[PDB]
Amino acid sequence: ALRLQMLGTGGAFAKKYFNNNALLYAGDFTLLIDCGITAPLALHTIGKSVEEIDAVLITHIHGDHVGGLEELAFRRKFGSGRKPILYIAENLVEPLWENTLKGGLSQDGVIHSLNDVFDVRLLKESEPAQLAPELKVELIRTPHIPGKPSYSLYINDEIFYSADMTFEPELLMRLVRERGCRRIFHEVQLTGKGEVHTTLQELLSLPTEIQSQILLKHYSDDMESFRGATGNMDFLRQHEVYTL
Amino acid sequence: ALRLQMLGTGGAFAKKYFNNNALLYAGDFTLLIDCGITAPLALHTIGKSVEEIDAVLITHIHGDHVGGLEELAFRRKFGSGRKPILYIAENLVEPLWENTLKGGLSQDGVIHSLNDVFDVRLLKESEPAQLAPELKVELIRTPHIPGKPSYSLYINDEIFYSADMTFEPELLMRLVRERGCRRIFHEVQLTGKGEVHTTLQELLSLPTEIQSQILLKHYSDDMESFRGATGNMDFLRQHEVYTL
Ligand SMILES: [Zn+2]
Ligand SMILES: [Zn+2]
Ligand SMILES: [Zn+2]
Ligand SMILES: [Zn+2]
């Protein structure tokens, strides 16, 4: 059975919680979903070696989702030398390398492209990929920063992992209505206007049945002020291991 | 009098110590020297608001020195809106923006260049700059990664801050002999071959008088195994406030 453990559950600036990055365990296969500036410290905190990461999947380009990749890449290069598999949309490959990782990683005789530190495997929007015997993943293009591609994930045909996105209640409802969706992991912006994130006020306007599927992530340091005030939804606990 | 507090004293992969980033205090003026993936968490740990950072100086492009700049930039943009001053060599401006920060920070109507999030002030190699009444800083070009510009700092005409560099004992000796150098903060690679860092074995070959000036930084998680074995040198303590 698939297992999920969040390395962190926090929004980009939270300090009680690490960056919102997920570990999925399918048998011996370990997928890291996003790898922010705190992911190395978070891995250390739960006692997980970078050698145990079989693949990394990148949902969009922001420091709390890609800022730890340089450390992961170098440590694997200097350790066993095994390049982690990197799952990513084609339209994020060039920005991730050319505008994010190249500055620190590149070195004349040594590292020239993403392929020198990762085993790059492109995912196509709405084309499911069997990552491992019990782990199927489908990218869904969703909005976050205008003009920048960002993605959510549909897992094993029944788990929606929102990653970072603005409010899309028809998407949620359609996944539950047409695609068998049973569990939803949704980011939430607890205070302020939802310009590039989904607010708690927005999620509370969802129908009761959709709220019952939702565990909340990517949240700020005031999360404890809201415990018990999220209707039928609840907050993911950082480092807890969930089955499914 | 000038004061120094390391946000972290660790090498790039250390987990007992944060990334090797320095705070300098000259009266009310606060300079951050480098801003790695751990710098936001380290600032939080010592209770320092990002609003108190008056300027940031970048010695070279690596995640443990620039990987926290995206979070600093965004938090200042969304907070008081005051752009931090960024001191940097001209030949690092384009790689820092185009190949490191642009991917996550850029946004069509909003952020197009480094100047949209920083007040960029170029430093010239070997041209001292008075940052504040009691803080003069001079970039010295030193080797670290072949083909990449990286810099050390000469402060108030008498403090050498090595930042990241390979072994340059004639430089040290010449600064002590010709330029009045009284204190040296030097990176150290405790184990392994010194390909892009200075090893402890190398520093131990320095003359006794030069060792007496040196406090060690950028060190790995096995630092405590070496305490008392560094001749007349000693290890910097993370978060201690030093006068000078
Ligand atoms: Zn995020
Ligand atoms: Zn984001
Ligand atoms: Zn370094
Ligand atoms: Zn470096």
Author numbering:
A (entry chain A), B (entry chain A): 2 to 245
Give verbatim lines from the article.
The cyclic oligonucleotide-based antiphage signalling system (CBASS) and the pyrimidine cyclase system for antiphage resistance (Pycsar) are antiphage defence systems in diverse bacteria that use cyclic nucleotide signals to induce cell death and prevent viral propagation. Here we show that phages encode anti-CBASS (Acb) and anti-Pycsar (Apyc) proteins that counteract defence by specifically degrading cyclic nucleotide signals that activate host immunity. Using a biochemical screen of 57 phages in Escherichia coli and Bacillus subtilis, we discover Acb1 from phage T4 and Apyc1 from phage SBSphiJ as founding members of distinct families of immune evasion proteins. We confirmed the critical role for Apyc1 metal-coordinating residues and identified E74 and Y112 from the opposing protomer as further catalytic residues required for cCMP hydrolysis and release of the reaction product 5′-CMP. Together, these findings demonstrate that Acb1 and Apyc1 constitute separate families of immune evasion proteins and explain the distinct reaction mechanisms that degrade CBASS or Pycsar cyclic nucleotide signals.
To compare mechanisms of anti-CBASS and anti-Pycsar evasion, we determined the crystal structure of Apyc1 from the phage Bsp38 (2.7 Å) as well as structures of Paenibacillus Apyc1 proteins (1.5 Å and 1.8 Å). In a structure of Paenibacillus Apyc1 co-crystallized in the presence of nonhydrolysable cAMP, we observed strong electron density near the Zn2+ ions and more diffuse density in the nucleobase pocket, consistent with specific coordination of the phosphate and ribose backbone of cyclic mononucleotides and weaker nucleobase specificity within the enzyme active site. Structures of Apyc1 reveal a metal-dependent cyclic NMP phosphodiesterase that uses relaxed specificity to target Pycsar cyclic pyrimidine mononucleotide signals. We identified 107 proteins related to Apyc1 present in phage genomes and also found many closely related bacterial proteins encoded in diverse bacterial orders. Similar to SBSphiJ Apyc1, closely related phage and bacterial Apyc1-like proteins cleaved cyclic mononucleotides with broad specificity. Structural comparison of Apyc1 and B. subtilis YhfI also reveals that Apyc1 enzymes contain an extended loop that reaches into the nucleotide-binding pocket, potentially enabling stable binding of smaller cyclic pyrimidine substrates.
